[PDB]
Amino acid sequence: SALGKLQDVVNQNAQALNTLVKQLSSNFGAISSVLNDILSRLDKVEAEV
């Protein structure tokens, strides 16, 4: 626990990127999370939204 002040900073910097990558795989109200699975599944007008 001597270098906890640096360990906390490293852990926060890692958790930020982890949360960002995890939110990359979210839906946000769309029909799916994969971009290609939404592109090559419907027409252009229905996929633009």
């Binding site: 990127l17 982890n18 990558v21 995890k22 795989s25 994969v34 290609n36 699975d37």
Partner: protein, 50 residues
Amino acid sequence: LTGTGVLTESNKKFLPFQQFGRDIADTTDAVRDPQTLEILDITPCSFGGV
């Protein structure tokens, strides 16, 4: 599956029922060839700043 990456020979010994592996943060990093039943990782292609 789908994606873009450079494959390579892998050393990860999968299980007889597992097909594709994912590392932390839920990202596909290793897949199995369905024909020859070999394991090969999929690293992302080189990208950076100029």
